[PDB]
Amino acid sequence: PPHGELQYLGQIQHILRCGVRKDDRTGTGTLSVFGMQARYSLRDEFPLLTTKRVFWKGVLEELLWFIKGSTNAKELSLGPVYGFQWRHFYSGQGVDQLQRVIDTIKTNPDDRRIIMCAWNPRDLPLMALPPCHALCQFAVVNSELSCQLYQRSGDMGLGVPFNIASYALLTYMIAHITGLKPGDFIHTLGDAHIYLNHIEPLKIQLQREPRPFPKLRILRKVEKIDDFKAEDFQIEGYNPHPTIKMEM
Amino acid sequence: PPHGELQYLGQIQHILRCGVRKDDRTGTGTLSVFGMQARYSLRDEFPLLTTKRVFWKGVLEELLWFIKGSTNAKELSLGPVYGFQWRHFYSGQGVDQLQRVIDTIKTNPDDRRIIMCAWNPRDLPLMALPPCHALCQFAVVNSELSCQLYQRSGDMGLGVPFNIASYALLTYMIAHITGLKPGDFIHTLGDAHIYLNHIEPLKIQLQREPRPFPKLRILRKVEKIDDFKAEDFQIEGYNPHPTIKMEM
Numbered sequence: 001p002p003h004g005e006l007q008y009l010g011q012i013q014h015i016l017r018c019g020v021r022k023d024d025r026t027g028t029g030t031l032s033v034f035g036m037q038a039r040y041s042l043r044d045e046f047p048l049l050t051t052k053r054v055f056w057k058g059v060l061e062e063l064l065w066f067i068k069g070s071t072n073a074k075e076l077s078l079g080p081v082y083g084f085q086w087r088h089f090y091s092g093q094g095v096d097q098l099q100r101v102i103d104t105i106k107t108n109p110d111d112r113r114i115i116m117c118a119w120n121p122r123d124l125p126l127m128a129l130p131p132c133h134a135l136c137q138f139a140v141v142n143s144e145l146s147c148q149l150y151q152r153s154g155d156m157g158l159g160v161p162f163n164i165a166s167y168a169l170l171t172y173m174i175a176h177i178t179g180l181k182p183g184d185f186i187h188t189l190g191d192a193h194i195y196l197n198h199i200e201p202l203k204i205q206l207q208r209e210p211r212p213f214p215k216l217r218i219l220r221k222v223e224k225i226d227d228f229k230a231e232d233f234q235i236e237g238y239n240p241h242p243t244i245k246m247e248m
Numbered sequence: 249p250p251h252g253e254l255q256y257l258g259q260i261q262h263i264l265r266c267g268v269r270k271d272d273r274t275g276t277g278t279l280s281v282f283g284m285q286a287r288y289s290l291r292d293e294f295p296l297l298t299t300k301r302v303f304w305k306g307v308l309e310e311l312l313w314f315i316k317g318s319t320n321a322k323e324l325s326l327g328p329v330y331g332f333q334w335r336h337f338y339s340g341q342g343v344d345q346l347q348r349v350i351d352t353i354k355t356n357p358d359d360r361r362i363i364m365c366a367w368n369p370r371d372l373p374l375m376a377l378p379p380c381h382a383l384c385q386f387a388v389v390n391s392e393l394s395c396q397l398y399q400r401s402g403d404m405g406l407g408v409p410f411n412i413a414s415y416a417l418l419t420y421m422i423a424h425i426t427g428l429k430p431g432d433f434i435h436t437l438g439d440a441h442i443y444l445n446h447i448e449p450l451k452i453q454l455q456r457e458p459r460p461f462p463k464l465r466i467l468r469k470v471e472k473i474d475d476f477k478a479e480d481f482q483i484e485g486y487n488p489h490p491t492i493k494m495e496m
Contacts, residue, residue, distance in 0.1 A: 020389050023358055034387040035396045035434035037285040095377045110271055112401040112439045113371065115379035123361065129343045131363035135383060137400055137438045139282040141268050148283045148438055150398050152385055153360040186283035188436050190385045190396055191360045 005049055005210040007038040008164070012156060012202050015194050022193070030193035036154075037189070040164060042182030046216035047168050048235065049161045051208040052244040059165045060230055067098065068226055080159035081166050082118040082133050101138055102225060105178045109140035136167065138174070144183035145175040153191040157198035157246045163187070169216070169233075176218050177225055198246050205244055214238040253297055253458040255286040256412070260404060260450050263442050270441070278441035284402075285437070288412060290430030294464035295416050296483065297409045299456040300492040307413045308478055315346065316474055328407035329414050330366040330381050349386055350473060353426045357388035384415065386422070392431035393423040401439040405446035405494045411435070417464070417481075424466050425473055446494050453492055462486040 019031030040047040048054050065076045066083030069090075078084075088094045097116040104114050116136045123130040135150040149167050154160045168185045175182045194202060214237040222228055267279030288295040296302050313324045314331030317338075326332075336342045345364040352362050364384045371378040383398040397415050402408045416433045423430045442450060462485040470476055 022389065024360075032389065034389060034394050035285070035287060035432065035436075037283070037436065039283060089377075097377075112272075113379045115400060117379075129337075129345075131361045131365075135398065139439060141270065141280065141282060146282050150383065150436070152363060184283065188283075188285065188398070191387060 003210045004038075004040045004047055004213065005051060007040070008049065008161070009051065009206055009210070011036055011038065011192065012194070012206060015156060015192060016199065016203065016206075019194065022191075024193075029196040031196070031199070032191055032193045034191055035189070036192045038187045040168065040185045040187065042168055042171060042185055044215065045213040046165075046172070046235070047185060048165050048214055048238060048240075050211040050213065050238075050240045051205050052161070053240040053242060054161050054165055056165065056235055056238070059162060059169060060233060063166055063169050064228060064230060067228070078121060080155065080163055082120055084121055085119055086116060098225060102174060102178065105138065105140060105145070105174065105180070112139075114138040114140075136170075138171075140180065141183060143180055145171060145178065145180040146183035146186065147171040148186040148188060150188045151190065153193065154187075154189040156192060156194045157202055158248055160187075160189075172216055172218065173225060173228060177222060195248070201244050201246055205241075208241045211239050211241075212237070251458045252286075252288045252295055252461065253299060255288070256297065256409070257299065257454055257458070259284055259286065259440065260442070260454060263404060263440060264447065264451065264454075267442065270439075272441075277444040279444070279447070280439055280441045282439055283437070284440045286435045288416065288433045288435065290416055290419060290433055292463065293461040294413075294420070294483070295433060296413050296462055296486060296488075298459040298461065298486075298488045299453050300409070301488040301490060302409050302413055304413065304483055304486070307410060307417060308481060311414055311417050312476060312478060315476070326369060328403065328411055330368055332369055333367055334364060346473060350422060350426065353386065353388060353393070353422065353428070360387075362386040362388075384418075386419075388428065389431060391428055393419060393426065393428040394431035394434065395419040396434040396436060398436045399438065401441065402435075402437040404440060404442045405450055406496055408435075408437075420464055420466065421473060421476060425470060443496070449492050449494055453489075456489045459487050459489075460485070 015031050015033050019033050022030050022032040061076055066086055086098045087096050101114055101116050104111050117132040118134040120133040133152055137148045139146045147167055171182050214235050217234045220232050263279050263281050267281050270278050270280040309324055314334055334346045335344050349362055349364050352359050365380040366382040368381040381400055385396045387394045395415055419430050462483050465482045468480050
């Protein structure tokens with residue numbers, strides 16, 4: 001059974017070899033491939049990448065922050081996830097996308113419309129009816145919860161490993177409170193890119209052999225999504241390669 | 249160079265072998281796999297499937313209908329594409345998603361937010377802020393136009409082959425008027441399903457060897473998307489296997 005992280009590394013390799021030079025908002029330069037998909041199992045393991053050390057504490061903390069509120073920075077002393085509108089559009093108003101996902105899983109697990117979206121908030125004033133940055137779809141199969149993230153653009157070096165962990169964490173959480181087991185996290189990209197100043201670091205990360213994924217234990221029975229605390233979570237068996245500093 | 253249709257057939261096979269039984273709105277029953285992606289080249293060929301005869305005339309005609317108007321059935325004497333809100337939300341009002349896609353391709357081809365969405369209109373009254381059925385993203389790379397369709401659910405037997413043709417047609421059109429060449433059509437599915445009464449027909453279609461994809465010639469220089477007519481298009485070299493009647 002081949003390590004799931006191999007998909008990520010294969011994507012890095014593919015973009016390095018077959019990717020096209022393309023500019024972005026910062027005119028900084030990237031290598032880009034359009035359209036990609038990776039599938040990561042959540043069954044008895046958690047896809048926190050091991051070919052470099054991923055900042056798990058920031059993942060967890062930023063996720064909890066998104067889940068409860070909140071339009072005010074620093075307070076987690078604009079990210080790659082963008083969950084400002086997950087709860088609101090502030091107490092008990094707008095559409096609560098996350099709670100609605102949870103409720104649908106319980107009232108109709110076969111539903112094909114179990115979807116939550118996130119926007120880049122720089123888009124909001126820019127234009128009428130701005131396209132989201134990320135579309136998140138959940139599916140239930142045989143008491144298993146799976147999640148697919150579609151991102152219109154993914155930063156492969158910095159953003160992607162972090163997002164894989166974020167959404168897998170989200171899935172574990174929702175599974176936990178809906179009484180399901182986590183299944184797969186499917187990661188789909190539009191513009192999948194590597195910034196030029198990340199090319200050398202990533203070429204080196206490619207040489208590294210992934211270690212077995214760790215486990216994620218939830219230590220307490222939680223009934224509501226808003227009740228989760230950082231201390232409710234434990235990462236067992238994370239044995240990663242050293243940190244790689246990617247500059248941005 | 250392996251035939252692109254092989255991806256579709258591989259997906260059918262995979263769902264038959266490894267798919268899970270799941271009900272739907274009609275409680276009719278399907279085999280489902282969650283999360284799939286196929287990539288079809290549009291370079292000097294057009295992905296009109298050959299292991300059965302796809303209703304090309306309906307593809308073309310339904311697409312043109314979506315492009316100009318229109319909220320009134322029969323008039324193409326609710327589909328699997330769902331393009332009712334592509335132009336409107338009626339002359340010169342609401343947001344014109346399609347024209348905006350066209351304009352962005354011309355004003356900023358590197359843009360990562362070149363996205364159009366379609367809704368199932370049965371969802372519209374059902375709830376506030378309904379999730380779309382399909383998200384369509386365009387990307388430009390080296391004078392090439394590529395398109396990725398994300399569908400929250402795809403009917404593999406009937407809807408999918410038709411949609412592959414529809415969106416590839418759309419891409420050829422937009423390429424033509426933006427002065428680009430078609431690149432790839434990437435097809436991504438959430439719930440990818442086969443209805444149980446389609447299992448036998450599809451098992452038979454699996455045995456068929458695809459023939460080379462045909463070409464799509466555009467016969468006239470067209471400047472605006474609204475100007476395209478059915479007669480502007482020609483399918484050269486379509487040599488498919490016989491029609492398979494899938495009942496629904």
